[PDB]
Amino acid sequence: AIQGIEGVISQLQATAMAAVSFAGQLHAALDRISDRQAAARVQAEKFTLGEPGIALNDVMADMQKASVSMQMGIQVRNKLVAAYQEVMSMQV
Amino acid sequence: AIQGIEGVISQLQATAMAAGIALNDVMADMQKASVSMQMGIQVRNKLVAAYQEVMSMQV
Amino acid sequence: ALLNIFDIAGSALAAQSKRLNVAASNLANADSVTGPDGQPYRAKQVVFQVDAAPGQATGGVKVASVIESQAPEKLVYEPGNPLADANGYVKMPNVDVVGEMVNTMSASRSYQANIEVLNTVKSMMLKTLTLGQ
Amino acid sequence: ALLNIFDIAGSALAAQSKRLNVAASNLANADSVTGPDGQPYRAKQVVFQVDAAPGQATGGVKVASV
Amino acid sequence: LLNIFDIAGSALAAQSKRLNVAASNLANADSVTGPDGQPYRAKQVVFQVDAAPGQATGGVKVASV
Amino acid sequence: GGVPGALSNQPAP
Amino acid sequence: PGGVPGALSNQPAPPN
Amino acid sequence: GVPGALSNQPAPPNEAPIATP
Amino acid sequence: GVPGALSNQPAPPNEAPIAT
Amino acid sequence: DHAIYTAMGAASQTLNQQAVTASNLANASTPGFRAQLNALRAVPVDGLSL
Amino acid sequence: DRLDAALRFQQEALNLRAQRQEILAANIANADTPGYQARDIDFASELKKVMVRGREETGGVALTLTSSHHIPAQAVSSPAVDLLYRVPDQPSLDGNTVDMDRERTQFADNSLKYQMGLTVLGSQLKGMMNVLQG
Amino acid sequence: DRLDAALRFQQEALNLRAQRQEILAANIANADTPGYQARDIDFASELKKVMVGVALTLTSSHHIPAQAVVDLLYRVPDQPSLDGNTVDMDRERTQFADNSLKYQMGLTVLGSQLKGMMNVLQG
Numbered sequence: 001a002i003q004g005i006e007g008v009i010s011q012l013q014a015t016a017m018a019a020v021s022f023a024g025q026l027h028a029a030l031d032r033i034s035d036r037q038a039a040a041r042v043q044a045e046k047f048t049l050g051e052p053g054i055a056l057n058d059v060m061a062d063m064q065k066a067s068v069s070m071q072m073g074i075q076v077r078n079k080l081v082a083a084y085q086e087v088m089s090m091q092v
Numbered sequence: 093a094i095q096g097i098e099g100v101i102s103q104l105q106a107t108a109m110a111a112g113i114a115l116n117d118v119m120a121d122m123q124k125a126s127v128s129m130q131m132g133i134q135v136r137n138k139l140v141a142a143y144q145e146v147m148s149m150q151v
Numbered sequence: 152a153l154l155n156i157f158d159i160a161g162s163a164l165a166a167q168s169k170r171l172n173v174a175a176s177n178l179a180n181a182d183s184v185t186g187p188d189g190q191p192y193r194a195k196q197v198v199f200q201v202d203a204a205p206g207q208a209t210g211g212v213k214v215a216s217v218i219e220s221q222a223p224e225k226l227v228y229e230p231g232n233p234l235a236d237a238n239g240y241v242k243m244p245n246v247d248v249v250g251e252m253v254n255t256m257s258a259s260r261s262y263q264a265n266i267e268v269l270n271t272v273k274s275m276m277l278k279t280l281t282l283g284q
Numbered sequence: 285a286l287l288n289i290f291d292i293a294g295s296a297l298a299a300q301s302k303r304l305n306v307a308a309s310n311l312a313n314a315d316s317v318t319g320p321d322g323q324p325y326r327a328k329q330v331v332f333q334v335d336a337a338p339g340q341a342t343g344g345v346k347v348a349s350v
Numbered sequence: 351l352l353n354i355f356d357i358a359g360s361a362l363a364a365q366s367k368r369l370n371v372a373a374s375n376l377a378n379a380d381s382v383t384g385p386d387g388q389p390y391r392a393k394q395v396v397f398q399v400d401a402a403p404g405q406a407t408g409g410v411k412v413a414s415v
Numbered sequence: 416g417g418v419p420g421a422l423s424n425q426p427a428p
Numbered sequence: 429p430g431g432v433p434g435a436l437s438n439q440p441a442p443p444n
Numbered sequence: 445g446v447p448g449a450l451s452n453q454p455a456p457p458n459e460a461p462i463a464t465p
Numbered sequence: 466g467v468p469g470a471l472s473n474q475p476a477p478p479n480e481a482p483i484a485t
Numbered sequence: 486d487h488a489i490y491t492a493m494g495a496a497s498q499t500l501n502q503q504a505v506t507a508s509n510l511a512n513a514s515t516p517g518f519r520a521q522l523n524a525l526r527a528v529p530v531d532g533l534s535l
Numbered sequence: 536d537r538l539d540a541a542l543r544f545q546q547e548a549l550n551l552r553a554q555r556q557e558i559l560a561a562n563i564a565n566a567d568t569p570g571y572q573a574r575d576i577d578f579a580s581e582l583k584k585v586m587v588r589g590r591e592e593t594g595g596v597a598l599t600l601t602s603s604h605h606i607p608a609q610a611v612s613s614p615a616v617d618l619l620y621r622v623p624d625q626p627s628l629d630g631n632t633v634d635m636d637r638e639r640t641q642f643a644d645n646s647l648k649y650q651m652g653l654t655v656l657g658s659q660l661k662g663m664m665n666v667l668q669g
Numbered sequence: 670d671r672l673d674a675a676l677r678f679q680q681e682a683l684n685l686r687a688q689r690q691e692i693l694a695a696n697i698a699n700a701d702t703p704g705y706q707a708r709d710i711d712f713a714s715e716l717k718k719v720m721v722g723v724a725l726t727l728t729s730s731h732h733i734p735a736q737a738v739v740d741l742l743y744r745v746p747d748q749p750s751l752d753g754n755t756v757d758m759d760r761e762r763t764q765f766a767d768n769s770l771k772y773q774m775g776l777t778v779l780g781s782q783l784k785g786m787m788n789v790l791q792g
Contacts, residue, residue, distance in 0.1 A: 048679075052425060053426070058161070063778065068157075070788075078284070087133065089133075090133050091137050115280065116153065116279065123660050152557055163565075172292070179296035183332040186333065196433075196434070198432055201568065201571065206593065208613040208618055253493040256489070278650065285428065286763065287424065288423045290763055298447070298757070320463075335427050359636065366486075370491070384526065385482055385528065395535070430571075433567050437628065449745045451745055468534045474620070479630060480531060481530040486566075532632075534622065534623055534624055535626075
């Protein structure tokens with residue numbers, strides 16, 4: 001927006017005068033896990049396609065790693081949900 | 093720190109007077125943290141219950 | 152640090168696959184006489200090295216380079232074949248068939264052992280993920 | 285298409301089959317006086333080349349011509 | 351490490367050693383000389399009980415060739 | 416790299 | 429220092 | 445071209461005459 | 466040393482010569 | 486796992502000996518020929534234990 | 536502090552089990568490489584050493600990343616364990632001392648002992664959630 | 670459905686592998702027929718074609734829904750037979766074994782994807 005760019009220049013002036021989070025970390029972890037899974041899937045599809053240079057060893061190992069990463073994400077989600085349920089049971 | 097070295101010499105005077113990350117680590121610290129959080133929740137619940145029992149009195 | 156076993160065993164699997172492929176290529180061309188450049192086929196072999204960067208204690212295995220096998224070229228007296236020598240000494244590859252068959256068997260067995268390592272490691276990782284639950 | 289080992293070994297099988305066919309045809313025509321037309325039968329030979337391949341280090345066997 | 355595991359591993363090692371000795375002997379049925387010029391004298395392994403701290407029952411160790 | 420694996424698709428396609 | 433695996437390094441090599 | 449490739453055309457019939465026509 | 470035991474010193478390089 | 490290599494060496498050297506014998510037999514009519522003797526030498530591998 | 540100290544022995548034993556299995560897998564991978572002496576560690580002595588003095592690493596040196604656009608890179612970070620040589624059983628011309636029977640027996644034994652460590656640690660952690668359960 | 674889009678590629682690859690397996694086995698079975706041409710499909714191109722329709726509209730209950738209802742490439746002959754049969758044993762045996770292996774690999778990948786989608790939900 002024009003007013004949005006005004007706000008950007010205002011924050012730049014703020015930085016001049018002066019002279020990431022848990023949700024961000026969870027989003028980063030989800031993005032990393034999804035990117036790994038998509039990379040393994042894309043390599044598997046490329047191997048199934050018949051394109052040269054892609055070895056079955058690498059495909060199978062990358063699928064293994066993607067499965068392990070998915071399981072790690074599932075466990076983290078399970079605990080996190082359990083901790084949230086525990087906190088919401090706290091008496092106030 | 094200068095104050096940190098002051099604290100070190102103070103503890104020496106006290107002695108005078110007296111005379112990447114793997115799943116193995118990730119999971120273990122994750123479990124602890126869960127255990128410590130549960131302990132904190134239970135202790136606070138006990139304290140809050142005691143306080144409400146005291147305040148629900150009749151004087 | 153069970154994740155590094157993934158890298159170690161994957162590198163080992165790839166190296167053994169390359170070794171088996173090179174051995175099979177040598178075996179399939181034992182009877183060849185000509186190459187794409189007209190040169191006789193030279194038996195080739197991989198070189199295995201520890202896949203450890205400077206300062207790394209123990210790693211998997213890696214294929215450094217593919218080298219021509221050191222053995223006299225098999226001379227055949229056929230001065231009627233269009234490819235020949237000054238005295239009619241056709242040069243044939245120095246492939247030792249027994250060695251290549253034993254190499255293929257050894258590569259297959261080492262490959263299967265690494266697969267077992269990977270399988271049991273993944274099972275342990277899943278457990279570990281089921282630590283407290 | 286084929287896995288590399290499959291292609292190499294299948295090419296080896298096909299090349300050996302071609303060589304065996306040439307040998308059998310020669311053994312059949314050992315006493316032939318005239319061919320399709322009137323010219324004598326000439327013994328055939330099969331020449332094995334190594335499939336250059338991008339890898340070069342690994343490659344099967346092809347047969348350019350008889 | 352674990353007892354039965356120790357026993358089975360020691361016995362696997364002993365039987366592998368015996369198999370290797372037998373294979374080397376079979377290879378040298380017709381050998382006429384060695385490096386020094388002496389004849390090849392056939393090898394045979396000696397099995398002994400590995401129960402040093404385990405009373406009279408334990409694994410098998412190859413004492414000598 | 417220079418050598419393709421045995422379990423790879425026909426380097427020669 | 430590694431070396432060639434299999435047949436070449438398990439056959440009796442020349443002296444020098 | 446190479447024996448074992450894929451083409452959209454059937455191979456011509458395999459005739460082997462005994463005498464020259 | 467007993468085979469299968471642990472020692473801090475590496476085994477010497479072994480060789481199988483043909484002629485002494 | 487390494488007895489296979491001992492047996493493979495034995496088989497390959499048996500092939501070499503057979504090649505020598507066949508080369509000798511091919512020259513049964515060669516004028517003034519001297520046959521090549523063959524002998525299997527045993528090489529003991531010198532490690533530390535057995 | 537108290538909970539960290541109570542669960543520290545089994546946690547460290549399980550980490551050392553993981554590192555020993557990494558070493559054994561490296562030995563199995565290099566089983567056909569000519570000129571590779573098999574490596575292994577003394578579990579008990581190294582375990583006591585890690586408990587008295589905390590875990591340490593030989594390398595670990597990595598590029599610092601002050602900004603959000605710096606390219607992350609690390610050299611090597613291996614443990615401070617003593618990699619000892621295993622005594623060979625029988626000689627080999629290529630020159631490696633990886634005897635496969637020994638490798639696979641140690642692998643299976645380490646596997647079961649790691650599962651035992653997981654079981655003990657999980658039992659202790661449940662044995663604690665049971666208490667914190669009211 | 671989004672679930673179809675995730676599993677579309679592996680399902681189509683598995684179906685194409687089964688069809689090519691049937692074609693190769695038909696080539697094996699008709700090896701002795703004189704004048705039979707060995708046919709095959711180009712797996713990658715057909716997989717593109719399948720991966721890259723209009724159900725007729727049903728106004729009421731009685732209205733009947735729309736009723737539903739690959740290209741074969743000739744193999745280049747290697748050796749000329751006298752009966753006109755171009756089926757080669759070795760080539761198609763290797764192709765048959767390879768197709769069996771790839772069918773198993775596709776089954777493995779599809780099963781892994783379904784099992785992951787399942788353990789995401791289980792709880």
